Structures are given as C-alpha cells and as structure tokens.
Amino acid sequence: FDTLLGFVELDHIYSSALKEISTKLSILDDNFNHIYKHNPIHHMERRVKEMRSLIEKLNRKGLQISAETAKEHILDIAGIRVVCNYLDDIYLIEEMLLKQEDVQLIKRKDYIQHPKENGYRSLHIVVSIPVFLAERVEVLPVEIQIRTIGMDMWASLEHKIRYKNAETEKYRDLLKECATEITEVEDKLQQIHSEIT
Amino acid sequence: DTLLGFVELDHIYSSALKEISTKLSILDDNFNHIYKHNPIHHMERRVKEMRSLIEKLNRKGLQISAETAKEHILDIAGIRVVCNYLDDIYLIEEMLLKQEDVQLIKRKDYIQHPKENGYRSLHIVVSIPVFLAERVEVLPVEIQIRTIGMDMWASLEHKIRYKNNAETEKYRDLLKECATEITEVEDKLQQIHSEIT
Amino acid sequence: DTLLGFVELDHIYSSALKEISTKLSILDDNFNHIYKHNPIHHMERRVKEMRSLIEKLNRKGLQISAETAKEHILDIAGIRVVCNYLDDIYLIEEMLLKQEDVQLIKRKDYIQHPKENGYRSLHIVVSIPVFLAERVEVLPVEIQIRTIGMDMWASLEHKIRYKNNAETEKYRDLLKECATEITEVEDKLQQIHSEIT
Amino acid sequence: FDTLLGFVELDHIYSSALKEISTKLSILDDNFNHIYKHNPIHHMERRVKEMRSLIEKLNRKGLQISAETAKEHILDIAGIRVVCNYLDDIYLIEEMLLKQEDVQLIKRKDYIQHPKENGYRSLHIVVSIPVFLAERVEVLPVEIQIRTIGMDMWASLEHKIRYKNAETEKYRDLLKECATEITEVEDKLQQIHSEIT
C-alpha cells in the first residue's frame, strides 16, 4: 500500500542521517586523538526505530498514520549513542559537534546535570543535519545520547530489567546504588586522567 | 617538523575522504531505493604517500613542505568510484555536484574523449568541508568515476607503467585494443540493462 | 516453531560464511605477500532467504522444514569470489582445498565448459566446521569463483531472468555474444599481466 | 636485507592468526546471543607487535635477531583483548573457545583469580591456532587477554600513566582504590544480571 511505501523510505533516509552524523563524530574523535593523545569516544551505536514502533507511537498520540506524520511528530526516529571514555569527553564532544556550520541544535536534556529519579545519567541532544539524496536535500533530526562507559553499563542493565516487568521495582534501589557507585568511581578516574594530560 | 606537517596532511585529507565517501554511499543507496539499481559497484580511497607528494613538488620546482603540497596538488586525496554501468557515471556526478557544500574545482572527461593510450574515466576535483576538533578545513578531493571495465583496464595499465616502465611501449597497441573491446561490450551491457529497467 | 528452525538455519549458515571468508581473505593476503598480486578482487556472501529455500523444497517435493532444507540444499550459504584474472581462480581453489578442515563436496567447472547461454564460473561446494556456543556444525558452502568480467555478465543475466523472465529469450543471443567478448578481452589482459609478473 | 624480510612476513602471518581467532570469537558471541539474549563480548581489539619492539625484546634476551628467533621466543607477538560485559562472561568465553578442536591452550595466567599488586585484573591465555597460507599451514600462538569493561577502563588509565614515568608511584595507591572500587560495583551488576537471566 501507498502508506507502507513511505515508511520504507523513512527508514532509509533516517539511516542516511545516521551515516552523516557518524562520520562527523568519527572525524572529531580521530582529530582530537591526533592533536591530543586521547580518543574522547569509546564506541558508538546506531539504530533506526522499527516501523511497528513508529505506528504504535503514532497510534498512541491519536494521529493519522503515515510517514509524513511520523517525521513531524517523532524526532528520535534515528538515534546514535556516543559512549565516551571520561565524563569530560561527553561535554567536549557536544561542543565540537554543535559548533559545525550545518549542525543545528533542536533539543537538549542533560540527565548528567540532573540525574533521573531511577539514577539514569546521559546527555540527550536532538540535532538536525542536511542529508543529500539523489534528487533532493532533507534536513532531518537525529537524537544523540552522549554518555560515559559506566553510564552505558548502568543504562543497559536497567533497560534489560524493564522490558523483559515486575523486576524493576525489586531492583530499583539497588540500581540507584550502582548509579551512585558508578558516578563516584568515574570521577576518580576522571581526575587522575585530567592531571596527567 | 617538516615531517609532522605531512602527517597532518595525511590525516586531514583522509578525513576529507570519509566525508565524500559517506555522501556517495548515501547517493548510491537512495538511487537504489528509487530506481531499483545500485549505480556504484565499489569505491577505493587513497591519500598520496609523502614520497609521491615530494617528487611531484620536485617535478614542479616547488619548495618541499606540506603547505606547498596543500596549495599546489589537488589530488593528494583521491577516491575512485567504480560504477556498474556507463550511464551511472554521469548520474553520480550530477547528484553529487548539486549538493550545496560540494564545489566543483576541475573537470576532465576522459570518457567523452579517451586518452590516446585508451584510458577512460571521469575526473572531477571537488572541495568538501572537514570539521575538525578546533578548525574547519575546506579540502579538494579528486574523484575518478569509471565503470568496472574501465577500472580493470586502468589497473593493468597502471600496472605496466610503474613496474618496469620500459615495456609501456611494448603493450601500448595491445592495451588500446583491449580498451576498445571493453568499451564495445560495456555499451552492449548498458543497453540490455537500460531496456529492462 | 517451524519458523524458528529457519532463523536458526540462517544464523548458523551465516557463521559458516564468516569462517570461509576469513580463510579466503588470509589466502588472498598471503598470495599478495609472496607474488605481489592480489588474486581476489572482492567477495559477496549471501544466505538464501527462507522463501528461496521453500520453493526449492517444493520443486523437489520435499517436506517444508529447516532440517529438510539442511539435508537437501547445499547452496543455502553462498559466497562469490570475484578474481582479478582468470588464472587466479584455479589458484584460489587449489590453495583452499588443500586445507585439512575444508572438504570438497561438489565441483562443476563452467569456465572449462561454459553453459550454453554463456555463463562461466567455477562452482565448488565445500564443508567447513562452525564452532558454536554448545555444539559444532559441519556445514556446506557453495563457492562461486569467477573473474570480474564473468561477474558483470552473470549479474546482468541474473538481472534478465528474475525480473521479467519472458525477455530471457529476447537477449539470449546478445548475452552470448557479450560473454564471448568478455572472455576474449580477459584472456588478453591475463597474458599481459602474466608477462610482467 | 634478508633478515628484514622475515620480520615483514612475521607481521603478516600473525595478523592472519588474529583474523582466525577474531572470527571464532565473533561466532561464539553471536551464537550465545542467539540462544540466549546476552552478548558476552562487549568489544575486541587486535594488535601485532611492531618490529622495533620485537628486535628490542630479542636484544634484551641477548638472542640472535631474526624472525625465526622471534617466533620461538615471543608468544604474544599477536594479541587480542576481549572486553566482556560481565565477569562471568570472561570465564565463559574461555570455555567456549578452548573446547574447539583446533584451539590448543599454551599458557594461562588468571589475574582475576589473583590480582596484581597494583590492582590489575585480567585473564591471560596463550592459544595456538592453525593458519592456512598459500603454500603451507602455520600453527601460531596468540595471546588473548579476557577482561571486563571496568577492568579495561582501569587497565587503560594505568597504562597511560606508566609509559607517558614518575607519575605511577604518585597514583599507585589511588589506582588500587579504583581497582577495588571497580571490582565491587561489577559484582553487584553481575548478581543483578545473573538473577534476571
């Protein structure tokens, strides 16, 4: 059906958006290491929301179900997580990214500055990037989650408890202890690395 | 010190290659999504090694430094885009050059007018911005767009000149015949492919 | 349940493809280190999708399950090894089949004896052990070894049959001519390459 | 010089060795995730010792300097670090690897069972693997260091203090605190993950 075709196109163009941001981030990481001897980025992961998740979300909001609706109302269709070696790399990567001429900052939420009640810590920014296609240019939003390795280890276990669902409450306070415990050890590693660089 | 400049040159022109690769990969994928055909067969990136920069500077009587190479050699970074069919070459060019941040610097169409020795390729030098940690660099990249068959020829011819160049005269008439025979069969394959699409 | 078997089939035959890819990549690299020439131009792996397994099972009147497919279809996993020159094909075969953990199952040389329609490739089915988390599987893999030119032909011919197959008769005489013309030029390029090496 | 050639060959064949082990590990990781919903491996890194480090080491031992000497006396010429998500993945990966028919265990040292005085924790195993080359098979040793993410974060900062050299003593006891602090939080994450899987 015609409606179906748009969502296939949607997956493809947002994947291209991820390619654009990944290359910028890789170049930033690589040049920081060249000038300096430190790679701010440990690894990255990319994902594009599955069409079924998009329709569900659109259904939830009571909106007309098409790809054009999806673009307008869901801005983390494309997501990239940037896992950093040290806490200062997180803020630093953001500065290096957002000062680029063709990167527009759309939304920002700093769960490192303001941790979640559960203990989740990450830096969330939505940015827009031009994507040049065969016969047009698309300016597309991309959700970038920037975090430390420890933050990433915490968030993945928490996530694995939630979706797979009564266990979350059972582990809620102990996961908060780990989020606190992970924060503390990462600032000690941060301040040792700050001193020697 | 002089040597460091060339390491810097390699690094930043390699970053330029990543930027242009991503654009091309996105074009190829979008072209395929629209017309059910992948124009690009493969790509190969290369930065000219410092010894290839110096002899070219020497041949021009230029002072031997990375900044002189930067100013005077526009194929320091080169990417070969190998296409499945001859008409794909000109579609990749059109799709690339209409991007606002891609500027055409030089163009020479050895497909429209082959070299006497039989060589064919479309050469365009374009400029691309590279966003680094603490500065932006606009760098030229030489793009050689050719068919698979043109690439097989050029690789062998390139493998006649560099190793034991004296024989370049010995095979010149036979390599011209092969270039003609490759052209002939690629036009037949092009028109069979055009008819069914 | 039946569906799960096929997901398992895809996964383990994909692992077989990784094992054989690594062997071939190591052979290519070592051949290059000794003789200053890379025999392999590129490779493409593919697992036949479940719909391609079922119709083949149906065509044979076989019960529709992953275990029946496993027993009766030896090209579930296929890798195409595209070589730079015709003589490289037989050297890759010899180098691969002498490995103690590679067993030849089937061989058919369409280069020595092309198909009437013009197709050429060397087909060998080999078995490879795949070491999994909790068991070892010895799985067959169909390897199609061909030159770049053979690959261009087969891709177009393959693109005549599957989409709008009626025209397969229309282009049959013209595709035969192209296969002949590709053979002729690849033997000239082979002998120029052999002489300088 | 003739001696030089052997060391070039050495780098190449030990790199092939790394390719063989990487593929096995990737298949193990991927199959564990298929059967179970957990990827034991977070990431891997490969390195082959630089020729200058090999000569220095041979010089240190007062041995004749050739590639053949190097193979005999240096068994971590090829090294792969396997960074695991949880502490139990480390032991588990080892079991899955060493039960494979063509993997021979050569040496083992468990710094997780027995931490270093500084606080370093990792599992070190040297294994041998057949590498099939163009015209021979080589059974080559490979050093595999298996560790947790936290262990890897600890070890990299410690390493960055040592090579870059009076700072090591300054940070010695504080790095020991982090090694202890990292251990504690990783066993809490381990026991939460053990309970829900």
Short mmCIF file of all heavy atoms in Angstrom, two decimals, chain B residues 126-150:
data_model
loop_
_atom_site.label_atom_id
_atom_site.label_comp_id
_atom_site.label_asym_id
_atom_site.label_seq_id
_atom_site.Cartn_x
_atom_site.Cartn_y
_atom_site.Cartn_z
N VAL B 126 36.71 18.12 -6.48
CA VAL B 126 35.71 18.89 -5.75
C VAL B 126 36.29 19.26 -4.38
O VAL B 126 37.24 18.65 -3.89
CB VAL B 126 34.38 18.13 -5.58
CG1 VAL B 126 33.80 17.69 -6.95
CG2 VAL B 126 34.56 16.94 -4.65
N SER B 127 35.71 20.30 -3.79
CA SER B 127 36.09 20.72 -2.45
C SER B 127 34.98 20.33 -1.49
O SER B 127 33.80 20.38 -1.84
CB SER B 127 36.30 22.24 -2.35
OG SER B 127 35.04 22.88 -2.46
N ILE B 128 35.38 19.99 -0.27
CA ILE B 128 34.49 19.44 0.75
C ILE B 128 34.94 20.05 2.07
O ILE B 128 36.16 20.15 2.32
CB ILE B 128 34.52 17.88 0.77
CG1 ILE B 128 33.60 17.31 1.83
CG2 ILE B 128 35.90 17.32 1.06
CD1 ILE B 128 32.19 17.59 1.58
N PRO B 129 34.03 20.50 2.93
CA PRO B 129 34.46 20.94 4.26
C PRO B 129 34.68 19.74 5.18
O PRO B 129 33.92 18.77 5.16
CB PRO B 129 33.30 21.82 4.75
CG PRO B 129 32.38 21.98 3.58
CD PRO B 129 32.61 20.78 2.71
N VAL B 130 35.75 19.82 5.96
CA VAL B 130 36.03 18.85 7.01
C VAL B 130 36.02 19.61 8.31
O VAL B 130 36.72 20.62 8.45
CB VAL B 130 37.36 18.13 6.79
CG1 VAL B 130 37.56 17.07 7.86
CG2 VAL B 130 37.41 17.52 5.37
N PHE B 131 35.16 19.19 9.23
CA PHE B 131 35.03 19.85 10.52
C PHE B 131 35.91 19.10 11.51
O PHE B 131 35.62 17.96 11.88
CB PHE B 131 33.56 19.85 10.95
CG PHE B 131 32.70 20.70 10.06
CD1 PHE B 131 32.00 20.14 9.00
CD2 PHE B 131 32.61 22.07 10.27
CE1 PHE B 131 31.20 20.94 8.17
CE2 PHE B 131 31.82 22.87 9.45
CZ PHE B 131 31.11 22.30 8.39
N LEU B 132 36.98 19.76 11.96
CA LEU B 132 37.94 19.15 12.87
C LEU B 132 37.67 19.63 14.30
O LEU B 132 36.69 20.32 14.57
CB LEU B 132 39.36 19.47 12.41
CG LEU B 132 39.70 19.05 10.98
CD1 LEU B 132 41.04 19.59 10.57
CD2 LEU B 132 39.71 17.52 10.87
N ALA B 133 38.53 19.17 15.23
CA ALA B 133 38.31 19.46 16.64
C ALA B 133 38.23 20.96 16.90
O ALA B 133 37.41 21.41 17.70
CB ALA B 133 39.40 18.83 17.50
N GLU B 134 39.11 21.74 16.25
CA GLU B 134 39.25 23.16 16.59
C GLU B 134 39.35 24.08 15.38
O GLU B 134 39.67 25.26 15.54
CB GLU B 134 40.48 23.35 17.49
CG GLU B 134 40.24 22.91 18.92
CD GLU B 134 41.52 22.47 19.63
OE1 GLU B 134 42.62 22.76 19.11
OE2 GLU B 134 41.42 21.86 20.72
N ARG B 135 39.06 23.59 14.17
CA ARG B 135 39.07 24.41 12.98
C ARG B 135 38.27 23.67 11.91
O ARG B 135 37.96 22.49 12.05
CB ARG B 135 40.51 24.71 12.54
CG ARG B 135 41.30 23.48 12.05
CD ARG B 135 42.70 23.88 11.59
NE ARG B 135 43.31 22.89 10.71
CZ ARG B 135 43.92 21.78 11.11
NH1 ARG B 135 44.02 21.50 12.39
NH2 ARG B 135 44.43 20.95 10.21
N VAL B 136 37.90 24.39 10.85
CA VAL B 136 37.27 23.79 9.67
C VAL B 136 38.24 23.92 8.50
O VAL B 136 38.82 24.98 8.29
CB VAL B 136 35.91 24.43 9.32
CG1 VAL B 136 35.28 23.74 8.11
CG2 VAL B 136 34.99 24.43 10.52
N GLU B 137 38.39 22.85 7.74
CA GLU B 137 39.23 22.83 6.55
C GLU B 137 38.37 22.49 5.34
O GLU B 137 37.63 21.50 5.37
CB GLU B 137 40.34 21.79 6.67
CG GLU B 137 41.32 22.10 7.76
CD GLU B 137 42.55 22.77 7.24
OE1 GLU B 137 42.59 23.09 6.03
OE2 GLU B 137 43.47 22.99 8.04
N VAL B 138 38.47 23.31 4.30
CA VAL B 138 37.86 23.02 3.00
C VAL B 138 38.95 22.43 2.11
O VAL B 138 39.93 23.11 1.79
CB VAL B 138 37.25 24.28 2.38
CG1 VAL B 138 36.86 24.02 0.94
CG2 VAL B 138 36.06 24.73 3.23
N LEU B 139 38.80 21.16 1.74
CA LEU B 139 39.89 20.46 1.09
C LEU B 139 39.45 19.92 -0.27
O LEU B 139 38.29 19.53 -0.42
CB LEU B 139 40.41 19.31 1.99
CG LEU B 139 41.03 19.73 3.34
CD1 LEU B 139 41.51 18.52 4.12
CD2 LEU B 139 42.19 20.69 3.17
N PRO B 140 40.33 19.91 -1.26
CA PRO B 140 39.98 19.28 -2.54
C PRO B 140 40.14 17.77 -2.48
O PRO B 140 40.96 17.23 -1.73
CB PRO B 140 40.99 19.89 -3.52
CG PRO B 140 42.18 20.18 -2.67
CD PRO B 140 41.66 20.54 -1.30
N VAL B 141 39.31 17.09 -3.27
CA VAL B 141 39.35 15.63 -3.42
C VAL B 141 39.20 15.33 -4.90
O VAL B 141 38.25 15.79 -5.53
CB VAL B 141 38.24 14.91 -2.61
CG1 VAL B 141 38.15 13.43 -2.98
CG2 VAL B 141 38.49 15.04 -1.12
N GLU B 142 40.13 14.55 -5.46
CA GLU B 142 39.98 14.09 -6.84
C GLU B 142 39.12 12.84 -6.90
O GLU B 142 39.49 11.79 -6.37
CB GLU B 142 41.32 13.78 -7.49
CG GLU B 142 41.13 13.59 -9.01
CD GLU B 142 42.37 13.11 -9.72
OE1 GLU B 142 42.96 12.10 -9.27
OE2 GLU B 142 42.76 13.74 -10.72
N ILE B 143 38.02 12.93 -7.62
CA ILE B 143 37.13 11.80 -7.81
C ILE B 143 37.28 11.30 -9.24
O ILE B 143 37.08 12.06 -10.20
CB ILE B 143 35.67 12.18 -7.52
CG1 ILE B 143 35.58 12.90 -6.18
CG2 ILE B 143 34.82 10.93 -7.48
CD1 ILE B 143 34.20 13.49 -5.93
N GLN B 144 37.63 10.04 -9.36
CA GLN B 144 37.70 9.37 -10.65
C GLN B 144 36.52 8.42 -10.74
O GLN B 144 36.49 7.40 -10.05
CB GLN B 144 39.03 8.63 -10.76
CG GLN B 144 40.23 9.55 -10.67
CD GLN B 144 41.53 8.78 -10.74
OE1 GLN B 144 41.53 7.58 -10.99
NE2 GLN B 144 42.65 9.47 -10.58
N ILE B 145 35.57 8.73 -11.60
CA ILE B 145 34.38 7.91 -11.77
C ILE B 145 34.55 7.14 -13.07
O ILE B 145 34.89 7.71 -14.12
CB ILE B 145 33.11 8.78 -11.79
CG1 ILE B 145 33.23 9.90 -10.74
CG2 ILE B 145 31.88 7.90 -11.52
CD1 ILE B 145 32.19 10.98 -10.85
N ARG B 146 34.36 5.82 -13.00
CA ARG B 146 34.61 4.95 -14.13
C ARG B 146 33.75 3.71 -13.97
O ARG B 146 33.23 3.42 -12.89
CB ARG B 146 36.09 4.56 -14.21
CG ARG B 146 36.57 3.99 -12.90
CD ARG B 146 37.97 3.42 -12.95
NE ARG B 146 38.98 4.45 -13.17
CZ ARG B 146 40.24 4.35 -12.76
NH1 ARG B 146 40.63 3.28 -12.08
NH2 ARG B 146 41.11 5.33 -13.00
N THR B 147 33.61 2.96 -15.06
CA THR B 147 32.98 1.65 -15.00
C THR B 147 33.95 0.59 -14.51
O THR B 147 35.18 0.77 -14.49
CB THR B 147 32.41 1.22 -16.35
OG1 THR B 147 33.48 1.06 -17.28
CG2 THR B 147 31.38 2.20 -16.86
N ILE B 148 33.37 -0.56 -14.16
CA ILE B 148 34.14 -1.73 -13.74
C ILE B 148 35.18 -2.07 -14.80
O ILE B 148 36.35 -2.33 -14.50
CB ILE B 148 33.19 -2.93 -13.51
CG1 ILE B 148 32.19 -2.67 -12.39
CG2 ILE B 148 33.96 -4.17 -13.19
CD1 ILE B 148 31.01 -3.67 -12.41
N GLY B 149 34.75 -2.10 -16.06
CA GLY B 149 35.66 -2.43 -17.14
C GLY B 149 36.76 -1.40 -17.30
O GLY B 149 37.92 -1.75 -17.55
N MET B 150 36.40 -0.11 -17.21
CA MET B 150 37.43 0.93 -17.25
C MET B 150 38.43 0.72 -16.12
O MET B 150 39.64 0.89 -16.30
CB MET B 150 36.80 2.30 -17.15
CG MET B 150 36.12 2.80 -18.38
SD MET B 150 35.28 4.32 -17.87
CE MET B 150 33.99 4.36 -19.12
#
